[PDB]
Design an enzyme around this catalytic site. Structure first.
Site, mmCIF file in Angstrom:
data_model
loop_
_atom_site.group_PDB
_atom_site.id
_atom_site.type_symbol
_atom_site.label_atom_id
_atom_site.label_comp_id
_atom_site.label_asym_id
_atom_site.label_seq_id
_atom_site.Cartn_x
_atom_site.Cartn_y
_atom_site.Cartn_z
ATOM 1 N N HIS A 166 0.821 -1.222 0.000
ATOM 2 C CA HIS A 166 0.000 0.000 0.000
ATOM 3 C C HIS A 166 0.863 1.285 0.000
ATOM 4 O O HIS A 166 0.319 2.411 -0.047
ATOM 5 C CB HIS A 166 -1.077 -0.023 1.103
ATOM 6 C CG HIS A 166 -0.600 0.483 2.429
ATOM 7 N ND1 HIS A 166 -0.490 -0.328 3.542
ATOM 8 C CD2 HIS A 166 -0.209 1.721 2.821
ATOM 9 C CE1 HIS A 166 -0.048 0.389 4.561
ATOM 10 N NE2 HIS A 166 0.140 1.633 4.147
ATOM 11 N N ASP B 292 -0.068 -7.419 2.895
ATOM 12 C CA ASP B 292 0.246 -6.058 2.596
ATOM 13 C C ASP B 292 1.770 -5.969 2.682
ATOM 14 O O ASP B 292 2.361 -5.527 3.663
ATOM 15 C CB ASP B 292 -0.466 -5.097 3.542
ATOM 16 C CG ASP B 292 -0.084 -3.641 3.285
ATOM 17 O OD1 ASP B 292 0.350 -3.309 2.139
ATOM 18 O OD2 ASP B 292 -0.173 -2.758 4.175
ATOM 19 N N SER C 215 4.338 3.322 7.625
ATOM 20 C CA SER C 215 4.079 2.141 6.834
ATOM 21 C C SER C 215 5.266 1.774 5.953
ATOM 22 O O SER C 215 5.847 2.627 5.263
ATOM 23 C CB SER C 215 2.851 2.370 5.953
ATOM 24 O OG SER C 215 1.704 2.248 6.778
#
Length: 1035
Positions: A73, A101, A207
């Site tokens: 992502h 992910d 992230s």
């Protein structure tokens, strides 16, 4: 990310950047509150090296030389950098996991600057990371939205995502989604017992950010996962996707073509053909053919990797190959050629350990070969290669050779990085030296017997090594100064853009002149038209020559900086143009077997301030507004206390018309040959680099930094040769001889030891607080000025040696001023020269100590010339308020002398060159005076104590009976004991007679007057009275 507000924010910045006390390997780092209070220690593992983590935003981690790990992502970023950020690697395939992910992008090129990190040995194994025996500690770092958070849970935002890095600790983690994912309550940033000593929480932008663990089974750090989510801003905890071992395995594999094997028995070569319009190639030896895939159109990803094995491999390229993102790995020795002029480009080459590849294929303008692997790549193409090189591991030997037109060039440029590799030059034609650069952590350029000229030394950091590892001496010529006739004459542009400092030539149509202007700003309008100046244009005359000289002179005030190291069998020359005032600055290190030569300008060798993380002024302001003033604005400063010690060794440092300085936290081991130069050992003028740690670009700034702690003081060992108006300033720990002519030496050091030294027309000046030992001979023909300082000769007064040697100590004069001035002349010194003392200073001759048992014959002859005395002194004394003390000495008093307090003991005083000694206080024990005959005279006016002193008389004219001797030889306070002085019993001169004295209390004074003689039954001069004759006559 979010951190609590008990901890200095700079802590997390240094942590994440492995800077300050968080360098890799740092152990038990105890961390403290803003209130000075212990909070926990970083103590389960030594600090890991975060170098595999992308340099800039910390979303991606290198897990194979051509693969990063992140979160899928993260769809946005396409470029990644490492180390000091001075590089770029492009994603060529995001390698998105289909139901995690996670992604593991393939890069366009092999990474040279850093090694990949190990990944977790267990993958998605449920509950593995809860086990604190295997994994006692977790660390992370990232550049997500940055807050601080108080108890009460109030967040202050300090910066948006992707602006700087923060790292710290995170507690043990439990598993869910079948071990595929992991979480912990990292949001509890005050809970040290749960989250470790520096808790940190992932925010938006964190992230992809790495999670690391110390694996105690493997005894190493390991990457466990990458950050997928949190519980919003200031939330409770984060999740990470664990590294999918099988997936990662797949991604690497899918890029490899089937391995290629050379068959030695067949001979021939693997003949390599390639269709550039199809991306299909083939390698054929005999009856066997191996597929190859390279790039198609602009698609790098279509290129696949080759792995080569089989002893004595041969490959021959029949077409130019564009391999795209395909790399080549050599598992065996190989030779690669073309008969065609065919070239090769691709991800790079890995040369396995123990393997040698001889590579005779050129690259392409605009592309760089990347070379890693611990093995060796000899580059041996023909003619000019327009491509470049980046090397990050093993050895590259540059052996490019000329074509039939005499043209040759191995690479258009060479970058050396990671600290792992070595580039070897076979000759002076491989590479333009100005096109070599050392990147993050550098590595070695081995010039291999070849003398080279650099106009620049583009070296990122201390790891940059310039070396010569061969027994043929080579000279590095440094030539960075701007010369007048190389100053560009720029033309005015309608663009109105230029570089401040550049020179322009204006053919001025209004006055029909040629006008020269220096640009003062990055934009500009029309030149002035009347030879005036303004804020954009400085008018500098109608003379091109003068205008260029000005520009060169101003440029050259800036100086030059080298952060790296000079090693091995080298001379180094830095001969600057007359009129350079700036410094060559070296804050790296040197150890060379030849000579370092400087001429004009300045040279400074110094230690290096430890590099720290920093931030913009705005964010430093933001944190200070919150009461936290720890945030730095600059990597290094003059006032900081953590410096790295630097050592500089050369056979010889030749200085000429130059201003040389050794600064704090450095040691210099050499022989200095200074000609019309100042040399300052303990130079408070040192330099920082405002861009230290950020790549090869530097900005030099001069400042002051004085070593006060002893571990920080500079040290000097060796010899200084001073000539033709030089100046030496000793302000540090000095150990060396001085051979000087027409120069000056100043000493302010309290720790100077001078060995054998000869001074000619050179003043020696010890200033307030100085303390020096001349440990060997000292021979000057000029003054030695001791001014509120101490000089010991042969031995210091409070230390007894049994390994002494007889030494000479000669000066024209020895001159003390100040009540704290001390001259201590140890035993076995032949002293010479006058002693002058201004104020209440003290001079002592003699001391405890014994000669070494191992004296040479020549040392035995010099022992003999002492004639049984421990000290011999020739000189006059002028010390009216000084205390002068002598023991076991023979003083040859060459003119009238004075002392405030004089103390004699077993010393003999010979009147020399109608001379007079006068003192207020004399304390004389078992001493003697040899007076001549009007007569020589000793005068005491205040006090005369002691006992058993003799008066010898050298009757210069031999006397006759009945008639008249009435000469006072000594005069003292009336209350002086009669028995203080008495006639000698032995003859001095050519008289064969002996003095007779009366103690006449002749009004005001007691006197001792020569009123006759006595006959004889050897000893020509005062100087011929041995100590034995002298001490036994005492009785």
């Amino acid at each position: 990310g979010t951190v609590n507000n008990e901890l200095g924010y700079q802590l997390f910045r240094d942590f994440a950047e492995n800077k300050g006390m968080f360098r890799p390997g740092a152990t038990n780092i105890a961390i403290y509150n803003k209130q000075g209070e212990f909070v926990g220690t970083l103590d389960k593992a030594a600090m890991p090296d975060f170098s595999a983590v992308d340099s800039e935003i910390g979303v991606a981690t290198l897990i194979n030389p051509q693969y990063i790990a992140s979160v899928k992502h993260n769809g946005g970023y396409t470029n990644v950098s490492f180390g000091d950020g001075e590089n770029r690697y492009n994603i060529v395939d995001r390698n998105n996991a289909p139901s995690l992910d996670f992604h593991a992008p393939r890069l366009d090129k092999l990474v040279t600057e850093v090694a990949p990190t190990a990944v977790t040995a267990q993958g998605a194994v449920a509950g593995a990371y809860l086990d604190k025996e295997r994994y006692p500690v977790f660390y992370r770092l990232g550049s997500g939205t940055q807050y601080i958070k108080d108890s009460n849970g109030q967040l202050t935002k300090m910066g948006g995502a992707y602006s700087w890095l923060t790292g710290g600790t995170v507690g043990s983690l439990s598993s869910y989604q079948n071990g595929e994912m992991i979480s912990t309550s990292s949001g509890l940033v005050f809970d040290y017992k749960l989250n470790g000593a520096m808790p940190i929480y992932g925010e938006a932008g964190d992230s992809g950010s790495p999670l690391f663990a110390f694996d105690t089974v493997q005894n190493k750090w390991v990457l466990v996962g990458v950050l997928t989510a949190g519980n919003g801003a200031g939330g409770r905890g984060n999740n990470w996707a664990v590294i999918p071992l099988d997936f990662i395995g797949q991604k690497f594999n899918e890029d490899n073509d089937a391995p290629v094997t050379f068959r030695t028995s067949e001979g021939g070569a693997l003949e390599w053909s390639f269709n550039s319009s199809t991306g299909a190639g083939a390698l054929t030896q005999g009856t066997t053919t191996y597929a190859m895939h390279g790039q198609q159109g602009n698609d790098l990803n279509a290129g696949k990797n080759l792995i080569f094995q089989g002893q004595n491999g041969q490959i021959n390229l029949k077409d130019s190959v564009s391999q795209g993102a395909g790399s080549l790995t050599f598992r065996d020795n190989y030779t690669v050629t073309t008969s065609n002029g065919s070239t090769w480009t691709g991800a790079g080459i890995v040369v396995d350990n123990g393997v040698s590849v001889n590579w005779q294929v050129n690259g392409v303008k605009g592309d760089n070969l990347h070379k890693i692997g611990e093995g060796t790549l000899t580059v041996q193409g023909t003619g000019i290669n327009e491509g470049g090189l980046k090397v990050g591991d093993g050895k590259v030997v540059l052996n490019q050779q000329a074509d039939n037109k005499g043209q040759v060039q191995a690479f258009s440029s060479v970058n050396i990085a990671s600290g792992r590799p070595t580039v070897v030059l076979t000759d002076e034609r491989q590479v333009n030296p100005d096109t070599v650069s050392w990147g993050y952590r550098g590595g070695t350029l081995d010039v291999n017997g070849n003398s080279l000229t650099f106009h620049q030394l583009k070296a990122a950091d201390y790891g940059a090594v310039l070396a010569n590892n061969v027994d043929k001496r080579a000279t590095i010529t440094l030539d960075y100064a701007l010369r007048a006739d190389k100053v560009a004459l720029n033309g005015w542009s309608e663009s109105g853009k230029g570089t401040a400092g550049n020179l322009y030539k204006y053919n001025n149509p209004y006055t029909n002149t040629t006008d020269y202007f220096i640009l003062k700003q990055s934009t500009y309008g029309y030149f002035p038209t009347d030879q005036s100046s303004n804020a954009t244009w400085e008018f500098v005359g109608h003379s091109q020559g003068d205008a260029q000289k000005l520009v060169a002179d101003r440029f050259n005030t800036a100086g030059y900086l080298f952060h790296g190291q000079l090693k091995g069998n080298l001379n180094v020359d830095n001969r600057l143009p007359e009129g350079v005032t700036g410094a060559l600055v070296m804050d790296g290190a040197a150890d060379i077997s030849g000579t370092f030569t400087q001429e004009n300008g300045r040279l400074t060798l110094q230690g290096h301030p430890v590099i720290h993380a920093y931030n913009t002024q705005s964010v430093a302001d933001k944190l200070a507004a919150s009461g936290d003033h720890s945030v730095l604005t600059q990597p290094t400063s003059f006032s900081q206390e953590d410096w790295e010690n630097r050592s500089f060794t050369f056979d010889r440092l030749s200085l000429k018309n130059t201003d040389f300085g050794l600064g704090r936290n450095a040691t210099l081991n050499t022989t200095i040959q200074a000609d019309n130069s100042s040399v300052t050992l303990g130079d408070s003028r040192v330099f920082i680099d405002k861009n230290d740690g950020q790549g090869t670009a530097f900005t030099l700034e001069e400042g002051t930094s004085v070593a006060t702690k002893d571990a920080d003081k500079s040290v000097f060992n060796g010899t200084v040769n001073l000539d033709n108006q030089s100046v030496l300033n000793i302000n540090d720990i000095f150990n060396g001889g001085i051979q000087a002519n027409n120069s000056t030496v100043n000493i302010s050091s309290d720790s100077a030891v001078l060995g054998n030294s000869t001074l000619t027309s050179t003043a020696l000046n010890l200033n307030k607080g100085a303390n020096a030992l001349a440990s060997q001979s000292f021979v000057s023909d000029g003054p030695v000025n001791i001014s509120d300082a101490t000089l010991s000769l042969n031995s210091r007064p409070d230390e007894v040696s049994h390994t002494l040697l007889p030494v000479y100590d000669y000066a024209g004069s020895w001159n003390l001023k100040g009540d704290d001035a001390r001259l201590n002349v140890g035993p076995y010194s032949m002293l010479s020269g006058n002693i002058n003392v201004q104020d209440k200073g003290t001079v002592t001759l003699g001391g405890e100590g014994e000669l070494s048992p191992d004296l040479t014959l020549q040392n035995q002859m010099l022992y003999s010339l002492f004639n049984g005395y421990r000290n011999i002194w020739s000189g006059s004394l002028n010390a009216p308020d000084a205390t002068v003390s002598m023991t076991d000495t023979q003083w040859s008093m060459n003119g009238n002398s004075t002392a405030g307090n004089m103390k004699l003991n077993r010393t003999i005083v010979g009147f020399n060159g109608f001379t007079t000694l006068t003192t207020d206080n004399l304390d004389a024990v078992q001493s003697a005076f040899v007076m001549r005959t009007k007569a020589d005279k000793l005068v005491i006016n205040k006090s005369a104590t002691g006992h058993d002193n003799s008066i010898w008389v050298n009757f210069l004219k031999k006397p006759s009976n009945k008639d008249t001797l009435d000469i006072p030889l000594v005069s003292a306070p009336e209350a002086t004991a009669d028995n203080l002085f008495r006639a000698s019993t032995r003859v001095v001169g050519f008289s064969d007679v002996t003095p007779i004295l009366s103690v006449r209390k002749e009004d005001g004074k007691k006197e001792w007057v020569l009123d006759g003689y006595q006959v004889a039954r050897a000893a020509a001069t005062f100087m011929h009275i041995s100590y034995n004759n002298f001490i036994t006559e005492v009785n």
